[PDB]
Amino acid sequence: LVPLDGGRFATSDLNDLYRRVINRNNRLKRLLELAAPDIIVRNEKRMLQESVDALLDNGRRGRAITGSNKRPLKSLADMIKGKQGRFRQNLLGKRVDYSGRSVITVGPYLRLHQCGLPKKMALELFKPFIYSKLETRGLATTIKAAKKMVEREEAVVWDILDEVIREHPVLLNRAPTLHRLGIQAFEPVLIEGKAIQLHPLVCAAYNADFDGDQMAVHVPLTLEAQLEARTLMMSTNNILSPASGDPIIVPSQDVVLGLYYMTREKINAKGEGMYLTGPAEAEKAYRTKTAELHARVKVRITETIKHENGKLTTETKMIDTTVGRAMLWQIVPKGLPYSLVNQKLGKKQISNLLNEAYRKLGLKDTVIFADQIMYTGFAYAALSGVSVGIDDMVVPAAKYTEIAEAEEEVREIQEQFQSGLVTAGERYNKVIDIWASTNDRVAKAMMENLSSEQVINRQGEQEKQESFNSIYMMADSGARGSAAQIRQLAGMRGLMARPDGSIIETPITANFKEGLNVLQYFISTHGARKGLADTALKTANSGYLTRRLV
Amino acid sequence: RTTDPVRMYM
């Protein structure tokens, strides 16, 4: 029972329950002292029993006793039990000191074991260490002087902070922590700002995107905790998924797009047919504007294989490849074949490269290779200039003809329905079937029109080339997008379902490039709301299942 | 049949 600001007092309901019990017990004693009639004594004993039951467990015996808030009083059983009880709110989970929280940005310059930490935030977190080092070197005589210097933010305080966090690991955690990869150890690097800079390659581990996400930071204090963070929880050690064993630091989005663009092949490109001494000469040709990234050349490659028994065999041979493939081979560590890079590199190919590097070379080589891959992918995605435009969404000319044919035979079968040849259910089924078939045909036509182009080769004839469309490159590389989303963008949206689940006969015969009308948008919202609500409830279901399993 | 002490008192 403690005073609040303004003279108000804050009390626990246990005080009210105890007061009720004491009052009823004293009344019972007084009644027994007065030689009371039996009925009053029985009533008082019933009231005493009810008060004790309410104090121990309110609401179990009968109507729950409520106070002046018209809300049941909280008893000891409620205090020890429940999601808000002591066990789950204060024993199995706690609020901790030496912790902070900030919005996360992307640091493309960071290494896999480094995280960007604000200077002020680190100053607040590492304050006792700063005091210790400010006294050790004699800059502050006592702890009060050190506190004053830290508060005044002197330059020597910044140097002390830089010396403190040099090899001190820090813990980064993002809610919810679905798996153990949601908490990792990094080496802090002081940055000017208020947002934590995070390595891109750990984002898939954190399930984190930079749209307003916040991350918490913790400071291990004892030597044991620091070594636990360095040895077990460091990001350089956690590059394999504990659920499957597959790599978890695989590149995505810009890195995959850049590695795909650089490793593509173009017909009759500048510098075609040239002979290059190696990756260095390929890079030299690219920087001198002699040859394009996608020019077919012959490159002398020195390639070393580390066999299963440990044999290291080096073979130098001339391989038909592209300039970009050799320039990417310039960063591939020794011990891997050139066939891993002598192809267009999607997400699957880069994942295979990283997995092979881990299986044949180890962890350090894999970490350096991943960092170099991310750097090269970012750089050449920037140099590519890939952009989305309204002309990149090419709607096939066969879509309108297919729609007209489907509508015509729908009219025909409606006429058949008026004749009684078929029932309503059969008509519904075949209308749905034809609309699915027409959607498939339109998607196939759009994909064929989007996946290929005709070019002129050296001899002057017309040759078949894979298209360089930005959306097609994004989908094929596996960076972002798929066939279905391209179908919605440039083909047909398809049949959609009613709120109960039934599929509407008339589908959305319009894509997002042409634009939907009011009815089609309403039908789309019908399913969008369902998806959002299903995600919201399934999150709680998965959380409960995970808690039970743990 | 009832759990309210008031009803029992009445």
């Binding site: 403690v2 609040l4 804050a10 005589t141 006592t142 702890i143 002087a145 | -």
Partner: protein, 101 residues
């Protein structure tokens, strides 16, 4: 509290009776500095000050009990404490103790 339902007022009440760890560290540093400064005195005045202020002992003592152990009277104890205070006010051996004010 507010429009929430899982938050309660009791989670926003501090423990004002607690001592900040900075204050406890300052107290320990002050004890060490006082010991160091008193070590720069002769045992007589150092122990006179210690017993007159209760440093490293349970109870404070008046002038009479301080005088009794030395067998000397009260007035000599008073001027001994005055001499100790005057000597400890010299800035040659009082810069470290000044930072605690």
């Amino acid at each position: 509290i507010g429009d929430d339902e899982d938050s309660h007022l009791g989670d926003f009440i501090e423990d004002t009776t607690l001592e900040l760890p900075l204050d406890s560290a300052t107290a320990t540093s002050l004890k060490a500095a006082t010991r160091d400064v008193l070590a720069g005195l002769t045992p007589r005045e150092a122990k006179v000050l210690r017993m007159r202020f209760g440093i490293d002992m349970n109870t404070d003592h008046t002038l009479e009990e301080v005088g009794k152990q030395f067998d000397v009277t009260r007035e000599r104890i008073r001027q001994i404490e005055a001499k100790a205070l005057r000597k400890l006010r010299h800035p040659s051996r009082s810069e470290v103790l000044r930072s605690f004010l």
